[PDB]
Amino acid sequence: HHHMVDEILKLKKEKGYIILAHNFQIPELQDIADFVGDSLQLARKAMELSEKKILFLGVDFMAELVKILNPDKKVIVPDRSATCPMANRLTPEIIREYREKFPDAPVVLYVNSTSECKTLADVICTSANAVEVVKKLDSSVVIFGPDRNLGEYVAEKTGKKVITIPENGHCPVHQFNAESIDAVRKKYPDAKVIVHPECPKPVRDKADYVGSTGQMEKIPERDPSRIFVIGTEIGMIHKLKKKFPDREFVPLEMAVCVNMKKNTLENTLHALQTESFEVILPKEVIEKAKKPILRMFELMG
Ligand SMILES: O=C(O)c1ccc(S)nc1C(=O)O
Ligand code: SF4
Ligand SMILES: [Cl-]
């Protein structure tokens, strides 16, 4: 690890790579990254860079997001199989089926979606902006995927009708038990519970705050509470504890995204040695997927 970390830092400098790491990476990889953040934060950061080579540490749809918004940069990932099972359950066939049945409902796709699915979306959204995006659409009905929990949250906050696809679209990592909140309230009476909107409704409704990872790291800037209980993937505990060393961050439960943990010091070192595996999308996919991303930027403009 001493070897691997030094060799990584050496090869990144030597070959002109910037390392971008998602919040759900292992701490060792967060610590060697130039920037750690959420998928949109990392894509927007990449647009600002003078460097034309990126080593991306996350899962495929996010690396592809970076590539869509930075087509002329070389983007490589250490494990080409790192993917989002939830994203992968939504298909072009299901989107087209639902557009045909509800032709007046805009297709709002969570950024946790395949690039192919993005080519068919009317607008992209993040967990932070989903409510605001859906509020600003003309329609009082939207098609939303692939996360049924976030879709239902959006319906609650907007009062709009949200038709969720696919059937039972969810993120296994965020299926905490509401009983975990009951238990931490007893154990740390003054702790603030922050959970993800991908969490099920009973968990959301028992939390002090519901928010994206990006929103979670901003809450201690306005809430002086000593202890925060965190209902997301375990990588966020490391991120939060680094940003706010003066507070305590307690996992609601241990929750690990197996795909996020496919990236390691070893295979990150192999990626810089070989300059593989490059993220390549057909130009047509990039052009089409860009349209609902730009719409998102326009709506949040
Ligand atoms: O930031 C978020 O809340 C979030 C949660 C899960 C996953 S895979 N990604 C993200 C994100 O980068 O937006
Ligand atoms: S944490 Fe959930 S939403 Fe994020 S990549 Fe892993 S399975 Fe997909
Ligand atoms: Cl570019």
Curated annotation (Swiss-Prot):
Gene: nadA
Free-text comment on the cofactor: Binds 1 [4Fe-4S] cluster per subunit.
Catalysed reaction, written as an equation: iminosuccinate + dihydroxyacetone phosphate = quinolinate + phosphate + 2 H2O + H(+)
Lineage: Bacteria, Thermotogati, Thermotogota, Thermotogae, Thermotogales
NCBIfam families with a match to the protein in the record: nadA, PRK09375.1-2
UniProt name for this protein: Quinolinate synthase
Class of enzymatic activity (EC top level): transferase
Cofactor: [4Fe-4S] cluster
A Gene Ontology BP annotation from the UniProt entry: 'de novo' NAD biosynthetic process from L-aspartate
Function per UniProt: Catalyzes the condensation of iminoaspartate with dihydroxyacetone phosphate to form quinolinate.
Species of origin: Thermotoga maritima (strain ATCC 43589 / DSM 3109 / JCM 10099 / NBRC 100826 / MSB8)
